[PDB]
Design an enzyme around this catalytic site. Structure first.
Site, PDB file in Angstrom:
ATOM      1  N   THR A  58       0.697  -1.338   0.000  1.00 40.07           N
ATOM      2  CA  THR A  58       0.000   0.000   0.000  1.00 40.07           C
ATOM      3  C   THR A  58       0.720   1.382   0.000  1.00 40.07           C
ATOM      4  O   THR A  58       1.562   1.640   0.800  1.00 40.07           O
ATOM      5  CB  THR A  58      -1.026   0.041   1.130  1.00 40.07           C
ATOM      6  N   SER A  59       0.339   2.261  -0.910  1.00 39.92           N
ATOM      7  CA  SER A  59       0.689   3.665  -0.924  1.00 39.92           C
ATOM      8  C   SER A  59      -0.627   4.425  -0.986  1.00 39.92           C
ATOM      9  O   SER A  59      -1.314   4.388  -2.004  1.00 39.92           O
ATOM     10  CB  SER A  59       1.548   3.984  -2.143  1.00 39.92           C
ATOM     11  N   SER A 114       2.923   0.954   3.366  1.00 38.54           N
ATOM     12  CA  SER A 114       4.345   0.605   3.281  1.00 38.54           C
ATOM     13  C   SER A 114       5.133   1.540   2.359  1.00 38.54           C
ATOM     14  O   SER A 114       6.296   1.840   2.620  1.00 38.54           O
ATOM     15  CB  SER A 114       4.506  -0.839   2.802  1.00 38.54           C
TER      16      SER A 114
END
Ligand SMILES: [Cl-]
Ligand SMILES: [Mg+2]
Ligand SMILES: [Mg+2]
Ligand SMILES: [Mg+2]
Ligand SMILES: [Mg+2]
EC number: 3.4.25.1
Lengths: 204, 231, 243, 250, 244, 196, 226, 241, 195
Positions: F1-2, F129
C-alpha cells in the site's frame, strides 16, 4: 501422541453388481502393545453399515451416538434410515465438533431399499464427504489399501468374486502395517441378505 | 383505595399511596431534631424503649468522619440507606481522595429512593433521615424523605410531635445561626428545641442522644452520662 | 372498567389512563418556564418557601446536562432527577462515539423514547414530570417540552406546573409583540416577570426565583445560572411590573 | 421492565375446558373458508382472497404459502398469526432437519414441528394461543401425497379432504359426496372450485381465488440444469389465467 | 403489575387438593377410552378414536397408540398435543439410558421419569399441568410384562388390567369381573374389545373407530414384538371375536 | 500500500495504488482501496484487507444510522467512529486508515488513524508501506490552498515515487475528488505516471 | 485445487478441477468443487474441504430463507456479505477460500473471498494451489467483451493449466455457466482428459482363494411376528 | 373481565386491546393520503399547529426512515417516534447484513411481525399507530405498504388513513374506476403532488394554505419532504386552472 | 499408581494390585489397597495420577450405590463398565481430565459368568480373559498367552498369577512392595490374605 494412530486399525468398502462389501481388521492396541483381537470396527443400523477407524474411545462413542440418533429417526420417520441420508447425518454430526473433533475415519456402506442402488461413502475427521463409485479406504494402512484397491478392483463384480477382491485388499494391506491385523471380518451385502465372514490371517 | 396495592400505580388525582403510607411510618417514629450554625452542626434525638427492662433504640448513625445522620421510622431501612452512604463516602475518598460533599450525598440518597417508587415488586423506604456534615463549604443540614425529596435547611425536626420543635427553631432562627465557636450553646439550643415536642416524659440520661460535627470536630455521638451535662 | 388500574392498558377510548394520572401530578407542581431568544434559551422556575428554615439559594432545581443543555421540570422532583440522570448517560455515550456534543433535537428524542418506554409495560410507572429543556448546538437555539406520555415538540415559549395558564398567556403576548425576536438579556427580565405573575396561583406562601440561560453571545453557548447583580436586576424589573 | 408474566395464561376451568384454546377456535370459525383435497397423483389447497379494500393490491397478500419445495400451507383465522407461523415453519424445516439430514422434511414431521410451536403457545408463560387452523399439503418419497390439519391446541389430523373456517360444516358435507380414491388431480381441482363457490358471496374468478397444488415435479421452476436427481418443486401456485380456464369447464 | 393476571396454577385448595390437577382429570374423563390388559404371554392395548369422519385418512392416522421404543408403548387419553411433548421426552430418556448403560431401559424407570416431569408442573413454575393420562405397556427381563398408568398429578401405579379416559368406572367393573390370572393374549384381546363395545358412547364399535396393539413374546424365540394393528387387521379381529 | 489524502482550496482529494499482495504474489493488481463510508466522507485503507474492509463496513452502517436520526455527519464524527473501533480492538486489528471528507461549513478535512488507534488531524496525510519513501518529497512539495490541478499533480507525482520504490505498491493510481461540486473518480495508468 | 471465474457478455462462468488430497495422496479422483448457494448463485471452494462445503450450505440455507421472507430472488452481494462476516468472526480458523459468481435482478457478478473475510471484485479470478498456473493463462488470453463460448474456453483452459502443472490439481474440469435471463447450466465433467489406460492383467481371484474361519448370516431385519 | 386489559382472547375470539389501539390511532385528528405515479410515490398529510407557542418546524408525522424509504404515521407522536426509531435501526441493519437497501415491502413485513408479537405476548402493549411506508423500489417500482396494530399489512395502488379515511378512499376508488390503471399517469412528481392535494381537497371539502399540509415524495434512490414554499408553489398551480 | 492385573477364569475374576505408594523420593506406604467395591459382585481396581485415582473411584462407587438403592437391583458388570467408560470419555475432553485407568471385575448373576473389562483414561473399553494397565502387560502377557485356559479353576488362576508377579519382581526396576489379590465370584468379593 497423534490420536489417529494410537490404537491402529483399518476399514475398506467396495461396490459390485447389485451388492456392496465392507471389511475391517480386529486389532486394538496401545501403540506397540497389542491389547485386543476382537475389536470389531463395523456396526449397522438397520440395513446401513458404518465402519470407523481411529481413536478407539471415539469409535465406541460415535457408534453409541449414531445408534441413539438412528433409533430416534426410526421412531419419528416410521422407517429405517437410508445410506444417502445417514451419510449426511454423519457429516453434520462430525462438523458440529469442528474445533474439537472426534479423531476418526468413518466409512458408510449399504444398498438403498427403494432404488436398489449400491452406495458407499468416506469422511475425514470433520465431515467432508467422499462419495466414490468404486471403493473407500480408511485407517493407519490407508496408503497400502489405496495401492491394493487401485490395482485389484474392477467394476460390476458378482458378490462371491467381490468377496475375494476386498479380502485380498485388506489382508495384504494389513500385513504391511504394524498397527493393523490380528484378525479380519468381511461383510457381503445384498438387498435382502447379508453374510459375515471371519478371515484366517497371520497373528503378528 | 383501588390504587394503593403497589408503588407502580397512580391514583386518579396523581397521588402515589404506597409512598404516602411509607411517609406515615415516619410520623409514628420518635422525634429527632437537627440544627446548625456556621461552624458546627448538631443532631438531637429522643430514643424510644420497648419497656422498662429494654434498652433505648439507637437513633444516630455515623457515615464518615465528617458526616452522619439521625433516623425516624423503620430502623432496618435506615441501616440500608446509611450503609449506602458509608459506601459512597468511602468510594469518594478511595478513588478521588475527596471528602463527599453533603449536597452530593443528598442527591445520591434521592436517586436510590426514587427507583423503589417507579418499579413493580419493590417497596418505598419507610424511614426519614436528618443528615448533618461539615465539608469544604462549611456546616450543612439535610432532610430526607422516602418519596425521594431531599432538602437543605438551617434547622428541622421529624417524627411524632416534631411540629413543636420546628416552630421553636423557626422563631430562634436568627439566634442559633450566630452561635459560632461555641459547641455547648448550640447543643443547648437543640436540647431546648426537642423539649418543645415532649409530653408526659422528660429527657433522662438513657433517653437523650446527641451528635455534633464542625470545623475542628469529627462526627461524634454522645450517650449516657455524657449528656447529663445538658439535662 | 378497571382500565385505569394498570399502566399500558388501552381503555375502550384508546387512552392510557395511568399516563393521564401522571399529568395530574405535574399540574400539582410548581411553575417552570422556558423562553427561546435570538441566540439561545432562558429557563426559570418558582421555588416555594415552605419555611424560614430553608437556606436561601441552596436547594437548586434547574439541572445542567453535558455543558450546553439546561433542564427544568414540574411535578415529582425525584422523577425529574431520574430523567436527567438518564439524559446525562445518553449525552455521554453520544459524545463518546461521535465526538461532537449531542444536538438538542437528538437529545430530545433520547429523553422522549425513554419516557415513552415507561408507557409500554405494567411493571413500571409513567414519569410524574413535564420537562422543559434546551440549549445551543451547531444549528442554533432549541427549546423543547416533554410530557409523561413521551410526547414532545419544539417551542418558541413553554410553561408547566400549577400556574401554566397564566404563564402561557404571557408567553403568547411576547411572541406576538416580537416577531423579529427577543434578546437574551430581555428574555431573562421577561422570565422573571412571568414567574412573578404566575405566582398568583401559589399566593399563600412566598417564593424564591431561580433563572438560568444558554446564549451564543452572552454565555458562549454554555449553560449558566443567573447570579448576583443580573439576578437582582431581573427581580427589580419583575417587582416593578406587578405593582 | 423484564417480562414478568412467567405464568400460564391458559388454564383448566372447573369443567376441564381450556378457555383460551376454545376462544382461539372461535376466532378460526369467523375466518374465511379454506379447503384441501387429496387425489391419487396430487393434492390441492384453496381459499378466497377476501380483499379488505379495492385500493389494496391483494396479490401482495399471500394466503397460500410455500414452506418447502414439496410442501404448501393455507389457513383460516388471524392472518398475522399465520404469517409468523409460516416464517417459523420455514426456518424449523432447515434448522431441525435440512441442516442435519441434507434433505427437506417429510410432510408429517414438518407438521409435527409446527404443531409443537402451537402447543407451546398454549402452556408457556405470558402468551396466548395462535388464532389459526392450518391446512398443510405435501409430498415425500416414502409417504407419497398427504394432507394435514393443525389446530390452535397443537393437535393435528390427516385428511383425504376437508375444510376449515366460515362455511366448513357445509363444505365438508359437499366433499363427502364427491370424494373417491380414484380421483385424478384435475378432478380434485374441479371439485375444489365447486366447493369453494358455495361459501363465496361476491366475485368468483382467478383474481379473488387463491389456489395451489402439490403434484408433478416442475423442472421448469428449478432455476438450473445439470443434476439429474434434482427435478424441481412439486408445489405450484396456479395463476389467475389458469384458474379462469377451469371456471369455463365448471 | 403482572400479579393481577396470575391464576396461580400450583396451589392447594382448603381441602388439600391441587385445583389444576383435578380440573385436568375432568378434561381427561371426556377423552376416548383406552384399555390395557396384561396376560402371561403378552399385553394388549385397545383404544377408541373420538367421533371420526369418513374423510379422515385412518391408515396414516395416530392419536392414541405410540411407540416409545421396541419394548415399550403407550396409550393416550387427553390432549394429543400435550401427549406428543411428553412422548418425545420419553423417547429421548430411553435412548439416553441405552447409551449410558448399553441396556434397554427398564419399564418402571421410564415411567417414573415421565411422572416426575408431570409432578414438577404441579409444584413449581406457575404453568398449567399436562392434560394427559398414559397407559404404559412394556417388557423387560426383570419383571417381564408390565402395565402402568400415570396422570397429571405425576402419580403412577401398576396394573393387571386398567382403563383411562371416558367411562372408566364402568370399564373397570367389567374388567374386574372377567379377568383371571392365567389368562392368555388371545383371551385378553377378546376381553378388551368386548369391554370397549359395552362402554362406548357410539352406536356400534367398528374398525375405523379403533386403534389396537399387542406386545407378544410371539416373536420367534426369546424376544419381544410390538404389533400396531392396521385398519384391515382391526376389521378381521372384530369378525373373529364376533363383534361385527 | 501507498495511500494519501490532501486538502486543497476547494476541498480534499484521496489517492491510492491498486496492488494487493500475498507475500510476493500480486493477488489483485486492480484493487480499489478508496472506500465510501458516506456521500462525501471516504477513506484510504492500509494493513490487513479483512480488517479494514470489516471496519469500513461497520462505519458505513454507523454513519447510515447516524444520518437517518441526526442528518449528515461531520468528518470529525466519522473519524471518531473509526477511532473507537481501532482503539478498543487494538489487540486484534492491523489497520491504518486515513479518513477524508468535505463539509460546507468545515470544507476539506483529513484525519489519520495509525495502528494504535490514535487520531491526528492534518493538512495532508500519507500511509502504507510505500509512504516511507515519500516523506521527504511530500514535506518539500506540499503547500496549503493548492488548486485542483496542482493537488492532482502532487498526488500523482508522490504515489508515482512510492510505487517506484515499494514492491508492495503498484498498478493504477486511483483518486477521488471531494468538493462542493460533487464526487469525481480519476484513474491514471502506468504508461502515464512512470514517465513522470 | 484450481478454481477460476470469468465474466462475459451476458453473464459469468466458473470452473474447477476434480482432485481432492490428504497430503500427497489422492483421496477422491472425481471430486465436486462447484457448490450451489442458490439456483443462480454458485461458488467454487479451495482450502479445507469440509469448511468450504459447510459455509456454503449454511449461507445457502439462510439465503433461501431470506429469499422466501422478502419474496425476491437472492442477490450475489447478499451471499458475499453473509460469507465475509461469518468468516471474519472466526478470524481465519474456518479455512474457506471461495470464488462466488451468479446472476440476479441487478445483473451478473463475480467476487472472491479469502478465509480471513476480505473480498475483491474482478472480471477474472483464480484461487487454490493451481491459481498461479491458471492466472498465467487468464492474463495471457483475457479480453473485454468475451462471448459465452470464449469464456467457457478460457475458463477450462485455465483449469487445464492447473491440472497439468500443479500437483495439487488433476483429473477433470467442471464448469457452471450463469447467463442473464436463463437457467444456470451445471456442466459436470465438461472435460475428461485423464482416463486411466487398460491394465496389463486381470486381478480377479479364483473362488476359495481366501482362508475363512467362520460364516454367519447377519440379521438386518427387525424383530419378526409370530 | 381481565381479557380486556391484556392481549388474550375474549369468548368471541376477539382481542380488545388491539381494537382499542386502532381507536388511539385517530387521537391526533389528522388525515393522510398516498398515491403512485409513473416514476414516484407521493404521500400527503394534514398539519395542525394549535398552539402559537409551538415551533411549527418541529411538528411532523412524516419520517425519513432510509434514503429510499419514507414513513407517515397516524397516531400519537410518542408511539410514532418509537416506531420510527425502530424502522430506522432495522433498515440500517438489513443493509449491513445483506448488502443491499431494505425494500419498502420487506420493512413493512418486519414492522408488522413486531406488531403481531405485541398482540400475542402479554407484557408488551400494541402501539397505537398505523404506519404507511412509501418508496420507489428497484424491483417493484412505486410502492405503498401499510401496517396496523393487528400486525396486518398489504400493498396499495393508493391509500388513505385517519378519521375521514372513507371519504378519501371512495374518492380515490372512483378515479381509478374511470382511468382503469393502477397509478397516476404523469411524468413529473410535482403534478402527482398536485393530484394528491386536489383529491384531498375534493374529498374533505376544505381549502389548504401552505402551513396546513405536509408532503413527502419518493423517487428513484431518494425520499424527501417538501418545504412550506415548495407546497405554496404547488397550491398556486392548482388554483391557476 | 503402578501395577494392576486381572484374569477371568471358569467361575471367577481375580484382580491383583500393588501395595506401594511413592512420593517421588520415598515410599510413603507399603499396604495401600488400590480398589473399590462398586456393588456386592463388582470390583474396580485403578491406577494413574495421584489424587484423581481415589477421587474417580469413590465418585463411581457413590453413583453405583445410588443406583442400587433407587432400583433395589444390582447392575450387570457390562452395564457398570459402560457407565464408567462414558464418564472417562466425557472426562477426556474436559478442562482437566481424570488421568485414571481401571479394571472392572464382576460376576454376572443372571448369566452365571465372570467378566473382566479393561478401560483406560481415554474411555477405551475392551472385554478380555486377562488384562493389565501400564507396563504390567509387557512383562505378563507372554506368560498368560501360553498358560491361560478358559476352563481354569480359581486355584490355577492364582498360580498363574503368582508366576506373573514373580516375573514382574525379577525384571521391573521399581519395587512395588507386592500385591493385594481379590477374588470376585457368585458369593461376592473376598481378599486372599496370604500372597
Ligand atoms: Cl421478523
Ligand atoms: Mg501388521
Ligand atoms: Mg508383531
Ligand atoms: Mg512496484
Ligand atoms: Mg400484549
Amino acid at each position: 501422541s497423534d490420536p489417529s494412530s494410537i490404537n491402529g486399525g483399518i476399514v475398506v468398502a467396495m461396490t459390485g453388481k447389485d451388492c456392496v462389501a465392507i471389511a475391517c481388521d480386529l486389532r486394538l492396541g496401545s501403540q506397540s502393545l497389542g491389547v485386543s483381537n476382537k475389536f470389531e470396527k463395523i456396526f449397522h443400523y438397520g440395513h446401513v453399515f458404518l465402519g470407523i477407524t481411529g481413536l478407539a474411545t471415539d469409535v465406541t462413542t460415535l457408534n453409541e451416538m449414531f445408534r441413539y440418533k438412528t433409533n430416534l429417526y426410526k421412531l419419528k420417520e416410521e422407517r429405517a434410515i437410508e445410506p444417502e441420508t445417514f451419510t449426511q447425518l454423519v457429516s453434520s454430526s462430525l462438523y458440529e465438533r469442528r474445533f474439537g473433533p472426534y479423531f476418526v475415519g468413518p466409512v458408510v456402506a449399504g444398498i438403498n431399499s427403494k432404488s436398489g442402488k449400491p452406495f458407499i461413502a468416506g469422511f475425514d475427521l470433520i465431515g467432508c464427504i467422499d462419495e466414490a463409485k468404486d471403493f473407500i479406504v480408511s485407517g493407519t494402512a490407508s496408503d497400502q489399501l489405496f495401492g491394493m484397491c487401485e490395482s485389484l478392483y474392477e467394476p460390476n463384480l458378482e458378490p462371491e468374486d467381490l468377496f475375494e477382491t476386498i479380502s485380498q485388499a485388506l489382508l495384504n494391506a494389513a500385513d504391511r502395517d504394524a498397527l493393523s491385523g490380528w484378525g479380519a471380518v468381511v461383510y457381503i451385502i445384498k438387498k435382502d441378505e447379508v453374510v459375515k465372514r471371519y478371515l484366517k490371517m497371520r497373528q503378528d | 383505595n383501588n390504587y394503593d396495592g403497589d408503588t407502580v400505580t397512580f391514583s386518579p388525582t396523581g397521588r402515589l399511596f404506597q409512598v404516602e403510607y411509607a411517609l406515615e411510618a415516619i410520623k409514628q417514629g420518635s422525634v429527632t431534631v437537627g440544627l446548625r450554625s456556621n461552624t458546627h452542626a448538631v443532631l438531637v434525638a429522643l430514643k424510644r424503649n420497648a419497656d422498662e427492662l429494654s434498652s433505648y433504640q439507637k437513633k444516630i448513625i455515623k457515615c464518615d468522619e465528617h458526616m452522619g445522620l439521625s433516623l425516624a421510622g423503620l430502623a432496618p431501612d435506615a441501616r440500608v440507606l446509611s450503609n449506602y452512604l458509608r459506601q459512597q463516602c468511602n468510594y469518594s475518598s478511595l478513588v478521588f481522595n475527596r471528602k463527599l460533599a453533603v449536597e452530593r450525598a443528598g442527591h445520591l440518597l434521592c436517586d436510590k429512593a426514587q427507583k423503589n417508587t417507579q418499579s413493580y415488586g419493590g417497596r418505598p423506604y419507610g424511614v426519614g433521615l436528618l443528615i448533618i456534615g461539615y465539608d469544604k463549604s462549611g456546616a450543612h443540614l439535610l432532610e430526607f424523605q422516602p418519596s425521594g425529596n431531599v432538602t437543605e435547611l438551617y434547622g428541622t425536626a421529624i417524627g411524632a410531635r416534631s411540629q413543636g420543635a420546628k416552630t421553636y427553631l423557626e422563631r430562634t432562627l436568627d439566634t442559633f445561626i450566630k452561635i459560632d465557636g461555641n459547641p455547648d450553646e448550640l447543643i443547648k439550643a437543640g436540647v431546648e428545641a426537642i423539649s418543645q415536642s415532649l409530653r408526659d416524659e422528660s429527657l433522662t440520661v438513657d433517653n437523650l442522644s446527641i451528635a455534633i460535627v464542625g470545623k475542628d470536630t469529627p462526627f461524634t455521638i454522645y450517650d449516657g452520662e455524657a449528656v447529663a451535662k445538658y439535662i | 372498567t378497571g382500565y385505569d388500574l394498570s399502566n399500558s392498558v388501552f381503555s375502550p377510548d384508546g387512552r392510557n389512563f395511568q399516563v393521564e394520572y401522571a399529568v395530574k401530578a405535574v399540574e400539582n407542581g410548581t411553575t417552570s418556564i422556558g423562553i427561546k431568544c435570538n441566540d439561545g434559551v432562558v429557563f426559570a422556575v418558582e421555588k416555594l418557601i415552605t419555611s424560614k428554615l430553608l437556606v436561601p439559594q441552596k436547594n437548586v432545581k434547574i439541572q445542567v446536562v453535558d455543558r450546553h443543555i439546561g433542564c427544568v421540570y414540574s411535578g415529582l422532583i425525584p422523577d425529574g432527577r431520574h430523567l436527567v440522570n438518564r439524559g446525562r448517560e445518553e449525552a455521554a455515550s453520544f459524545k463518546k462515539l461521535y465526538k461532537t456534543p449531542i444536538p438538542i433535537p437528538a437529545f430530545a428524542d433520547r429523553l422522549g423514547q425513554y419516557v415513552q418506554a415507561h408507557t409500554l409495560y405494567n411493571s413500571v410507572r409513567p414519569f410524574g414530570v413535564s420537562t422543559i429543556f434546551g440549549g445551543v448546538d451547531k444549528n442554533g437555539a432549541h427549546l423543547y417540552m416533554l410530557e409523561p406520555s413521551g410526547s414532545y415538540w419544539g417551542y418558541k415559549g413553554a410553561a408547566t406546573g400549577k400556574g401554566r395558564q397564566s404563564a402561557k398567556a404571557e408567553l403568547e403576548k411576547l411572541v406576538d409583540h416580537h416577531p423579529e425576536g427577543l434578546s437574551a438579556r430581555e428574555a431573562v427580565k421577561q422570565a422573571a416577570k412571568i414567574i412573578y405573575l404566575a405566582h398568583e396561583d401559589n399566593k399563600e406562601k412566598d417564593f424564591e426565583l431561580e433563572i438560568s440561560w444558554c446564549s451564543l453571545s452572552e454565555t458562549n453557548g454554555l449553560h449558566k445560572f443567573v447570579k448576583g447583580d443580573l439576578l437582582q436586576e431581573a427581580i427589580d424589573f419583575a417587582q416593578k411590573e406587578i405593582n | 421492565m423484564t417480562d414478568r408474566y412467567s405464568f400460564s395464561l391458559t388454564t383448566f376451568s372447573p369443567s376441564g375446558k381450556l378457555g383460551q384454546i376454545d376462544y382461539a377456535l372461535t376466532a378460526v370459525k369467523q375466518g374465511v373458508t379454506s379447503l384441501g383435497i387429496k387425489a391419487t397423483n396430487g393434492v390441492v389447497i384453496a381459499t378466497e382472497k377476501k380483499s379488505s379494500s379495492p385500493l389494496a393490491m391483494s396479490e401482495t397478500l399471500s394466503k397460500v404459502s410455500l414452506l418447502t419445495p414439496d410442501i404448501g400451507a393455507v389457513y383460516s383465522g388471524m392472518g398475522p398469526d399465520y404469517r409468523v407461523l409460516v416464517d417459523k415453519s420455514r426456518k424449523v424445516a432447515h434448522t431441525s432437519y435440512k441442516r442435519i439430514y441434507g434433505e427437506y422434511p417429510p410432510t408429517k414431521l414438518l407438521v409435527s414441528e409446527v404443531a409443537k410451536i402451537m402447543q407451546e403457545a398454549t402452556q408457556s408463560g405470558g402468551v396466548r394461543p395462535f388464532g389459526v387452523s392450518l391446512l398443510i399439503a405435501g409430498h415425500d418419497e416414502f409417504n407419497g401425497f398427504s394432507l394435514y390439519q393443525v389446530d390452535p391446541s397443537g393437535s393435528y389430523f390427516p385428511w383425504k379432504a376437508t375444510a376449515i373456517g366460515k362455511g366448513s360444516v357445509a363444505a365438508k358435507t359437499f366433499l363427502e359426496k364427491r370424494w373417491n380414491d380414484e380421483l385424478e388431480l384435475e378432478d380434485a381441482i374441479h371439485i375444489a372450485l365447486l366447493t369453494l363457490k358455495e361459501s363465496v358471496e361476491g366475485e368468483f374468478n382467478g383474481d379473488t381465488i387463491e389456489l395451489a397444488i402439490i403434484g408433478d415435479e416442475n423442472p421448469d421452476l428449478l432455476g438450473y440444469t445439470g443434476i439429474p436427481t434434482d427435478k424441481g418443486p412439486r408445489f405450484r401456485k396456479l395463476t389467475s389465467q389458469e384458474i379462469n380456464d377451469r371456471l369455463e369447464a365448471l | 403489575g403482572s400479579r393481577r393476571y396470575d391464576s396461580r396454577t400450583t396451589i392447594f385448595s382448603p381441602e388439600g387438593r391441587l385445583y389444576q390437577v383435578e380440573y385436568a382429570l375432568e378434561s381427561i374423563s371426556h377423552a376416548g377410552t383406552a384399555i390395557g390388559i396384561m396376560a402371561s404371554d403378552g399385553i394388549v392395548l385397545a383404544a377408541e378414536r373420538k367421533v371420526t369422519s369418513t374423510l379422515l385418512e385412518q391408515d396414516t392416522s395416530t392419536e392414541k397408540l405410540y411407540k416409545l421404543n421396541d419394548k415399550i408403548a403407550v396409550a393416550v387419553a387427553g390432549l394429543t398435543a400435550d401427549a406428543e411433548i411428553l412422548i418425545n421426552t420419553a423417547r429421548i430418556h430411553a435412548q439416553n439410558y441405552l447409551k449410558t448403560y448399553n441396556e434397554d431401559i427398564p419399564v418402571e424407570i421410564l415411567v417414573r421419569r415421565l411422572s416426575d416431569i408431570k409432578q414438577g408442573y404441579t409444584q413449581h413454575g406457575g404453568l398449567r399441568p399436562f392434560g394427559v393420562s398414559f397407559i404404559y405397556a412394556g417388557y423387560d427381563d426383570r419383571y417381564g410384562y408390565q402395565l402402568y398408568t400415570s396422570n397429571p398429578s405425576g402419580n403412577y401405579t401398576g396394573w393387571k388390567a386398567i382403563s383411562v379416559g371416558a367411562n372408566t368406572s364402568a370399564a373397570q367393573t367389567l374388567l374386574q369381573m372377567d379377568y383371571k390370572d392365567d389368562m392368555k393374549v388371545d383371551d385378553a384381546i377378546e376381553l378388551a374389545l368386548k369391554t370397549l363395545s359395552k362402554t362406548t358412547d357410539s352406536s356400534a364399535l367398528t374398525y375405523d373407530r379403533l386403534e389396537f396393539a399387542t406386545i407378544r413374546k410371539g416373536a420367534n424365540d426369546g424376544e419381544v414384538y410390538q404389533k400396531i394393528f392396521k385398519p384391515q387387521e382391526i376389521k378381521d379381529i372384530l369378525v373373529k371375536t364376533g363383534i361385527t | 500500500t501507498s495511500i494519501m489524502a490532501v486538502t486543497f482550496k476547494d476541498g480534499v482529494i484521496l489517492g491510492a495504488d491498486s496492488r494487493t499482495t500475498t507475500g510476493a504474489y500480486i493477488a489483485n493488481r486492480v484493487t480499489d482501496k478508496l472506500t465510501r463510508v458516506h456521500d462525501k466522507i471516504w477513506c484510504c485503507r492500509s494493513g490487513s484487507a479483512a480488517d479494514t474492509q470489516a471496519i469500513a463496513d461497520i462505519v458505513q452502517y454507523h454513519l447510515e444510522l447516524y444520518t437517518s436520526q441526526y442528518g449528515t455527519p461531520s468528518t470529525e464524527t466519522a473519524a471518531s467512529v473509526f477511532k473507537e473501533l481501532c482503539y478498543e480492538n487494538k489487540d486484534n486489528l492491523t489497520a491504518g486508515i486515513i479518513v477524508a471528507g468535505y463539509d460546507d461549513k468545515n470544507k476539506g478535512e483529513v484525519y489519520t488513524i495509525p495502528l494504535g488507534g490514535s487520531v491526528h488531524k492534518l493538512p495532508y496525510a500519507i500511509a502504507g508501506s510505500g509512504s516511507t519513501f515519500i516523506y521527504g518529497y511530500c514535506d518539500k512539495n506540499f503547500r496549503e490552498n493548492m488548486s485542483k490541478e496542482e493537488t492532482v499533480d502532487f498526488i500523482k507525482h508522490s504515489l508515482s515515487q512510492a510505487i517506484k520504490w515499494d514492491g508492495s505498491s503498484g498498478g493504477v493510481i486511483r483518486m477521488v475528488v471531494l468538493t462542493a461540486a460533487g464526487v469525481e473518480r480519476l484513474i491514471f495508468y502506468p504508461d502515464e505516471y512512470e514517465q513522470l | 485445487t484450481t478454481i477460476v471465474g470469468v465474466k462475459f457478455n451476458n453473464g459469468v462462468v466458473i470452473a474447477a478441477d476434480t482432485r481432492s488430497t490428504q497430503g500427497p495422496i489422492v483421496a477422491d479422483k472425481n471430486c465436486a468443487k462447484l457448490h450451489r448457494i442458490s439456483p443462480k448463485i454458485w461458488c467454487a471452494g479451495a482450502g479445507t474441504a469440509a469448511d468450504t462445503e459447510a459455509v456454503t450450505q449454511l449461507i445457502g440455507s439462510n439465503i433461501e430463507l431470506h429469499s422466501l421472507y422478502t419474496s425476491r430472488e437472492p442477490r450475489v452481494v447478499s451471499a458475499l456479505q453473509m460469507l465475509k462476516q461469518h468468516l471474519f468472526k472466526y478470524q481465519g480458523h474456518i479455512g474457506a477460500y471461495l470464488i462466488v459468481a451468479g446472476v440476479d435482478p441487478t445483473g451478473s457478478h463475480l467476487f472472491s473471498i479469502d478465509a480471513h473475510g476480505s473480498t475483491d471484485v474482478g472480471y477474472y479470478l483464480s484461487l487454490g494451489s493451481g491459481s498461479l498456473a491458471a492466472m498465467a493463462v487468464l492474463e495471457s488470453h483475457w479480453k473485454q467483451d468475451l462471448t459465452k463460448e470464449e469464456a467457457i474456453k478460457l475458463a477450462s483452459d485455465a483449469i487445464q493449466a492447473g491440472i497439468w502443472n500443479d500437483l495439487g490439481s488433476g483429473s477433470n474440469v467442471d464448469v457452471c455457466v450463469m447467463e442473464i435471463g436463463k437457467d444456470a447450466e451445471y456442466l459436470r465433467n465438461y472435460l475428461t482428459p485423464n482416463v486411466r489406460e487398460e491394465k496389463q492383467k486381470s486381478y480377479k481371484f479364483p473362488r476359495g482363494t481366501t482362508a475363512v474361519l467362520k460364516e454367519s448370516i447377519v440379521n438386518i431385519c427387525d424383530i419378526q411376528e409370530e | 373481565g381481565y381479557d380486556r386489559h391484556i392481549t388474550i382472547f375474549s369468548p368471541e375470539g376477539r382481542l380488545y386491546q388491539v381494537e382499542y389501539a386502532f381507536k388511539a390511532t385517530n387521537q391526533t385528528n389528522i388525515n393522510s393520503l398516498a398515491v403512485r405515479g409513473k416514476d414516484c410515490t407521493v404521500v400527503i398529510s394534514q398539519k395542525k399547529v394549535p398552539d402559537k407557542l409551538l415551533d411549527p418546524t418541529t411538528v411532523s408525522y412524516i419520517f425519513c426512515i432510509s434514503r429510499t424509504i419514507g414513513m407517515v404515521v397516524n397516531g400519537p407522536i410518542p408511539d410514532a417516534r418509537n416506531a420510527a426509531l425502530r424502522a430506522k435501526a432495522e433498515a440500517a441493519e438489513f443493509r449491513y447484513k445483506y448488502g443491499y437497501d431494505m425494500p419498502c415491502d420487506v420493512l413493512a413485513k418486519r414492522m408488522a411481525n413486531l406488531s403481531q408479537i405485541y398482540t400475542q405476548r402479554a407484557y408488551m402493549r400494541p402501539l397505537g399507530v398505523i404506519l404507511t411506508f412509501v418508496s420507489v423500489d428497484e424491483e417493484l417500482g412505486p410502492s405503498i405498504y401499510k401496517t396496523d396494530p393487528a400486525g396486518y399489512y398489504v400493498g396499495y395502488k393508493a391509500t388513505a388513513t385517519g378519521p375521514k379515511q372513507q371519504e378519501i378512499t371512495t374518492n380515490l376508488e372512483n378515479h381509478f374506476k374511470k382511468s382503469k390503471i393502477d397509478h397516476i399517469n404523469e411524468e413529473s412528481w410535482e403534478k402527482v403532488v398536485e393530484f394528491a392535494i386536489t383529491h384531498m381537497i375534493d374529498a374533505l371539502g376544505t381549502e389548504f394554505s401552505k402551513n396546513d399540509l405536509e408532503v413527502g415524495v419518493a423517487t428513484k434512490d431518494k425520499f424527501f419532504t417538501l418545504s412550506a414554499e415548495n407546497i405554496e408553489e404547488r397550491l398556486v398551480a392548482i388554483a391557476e386552472q | 499408581m503402578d501395577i494392576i492385573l486381572g484374569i477371568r477364569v471358569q467361575d471367577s475374576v481375580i484382580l491383583a494390585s500393588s501395595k506401594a505408594v511413592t512420593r517421588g523420593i520415598s515410599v510413603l506406604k507399603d499396604s495401600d489397597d488400590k480398589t473399590r467395591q462398586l456393588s456386592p459382585h463388582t470390583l474396580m481396581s485403578f491406577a494413574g495420577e495421584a489424587g484423581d485415582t481415589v477421587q474417580f473411584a469413590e465418585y463411581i462407587q457413590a453413583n453405583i450405590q445410588l443406583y442400587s438403592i433407587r432400583e433395589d437391583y444390582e447392575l450387570s458388570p457390562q452395564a457398570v463398565s459402560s457407565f464408567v467408560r462414558q464418564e472417562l470419555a466425557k472426562s477426556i475432553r474436559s478442562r482437566r481430565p481424570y488421568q485414571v485407568n481401571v479394571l472392572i471385575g464382576g460376576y454376572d448373576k443372571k448369566k452365571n459368568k465372570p467378566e473382566l473389562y479393561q478401560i483406560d483414561y481415554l474411555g477405551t473399553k475392551v472385554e478380555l480373559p486377562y488384562g493389565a494397565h501400564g507396563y504390567s502387560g509387557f512383562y505378563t502377557f507372554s506368560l498368560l498367552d501360553h498358560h491361560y485356559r478358559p476352563d481354569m479353576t480359581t486355584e490355577e488362576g492364582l498360580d498363574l498369577l503368582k508366576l506373573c508377579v514373580q516375573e514382574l519382581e525379577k525384571r521391573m526396576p521399581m519395587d512395588f512392595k507386592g500385591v493385594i489379590v481379590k477374588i470376585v465370584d457368585k458369593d461376592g468379593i473376598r481378599q486372599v490374605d496370604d500372597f
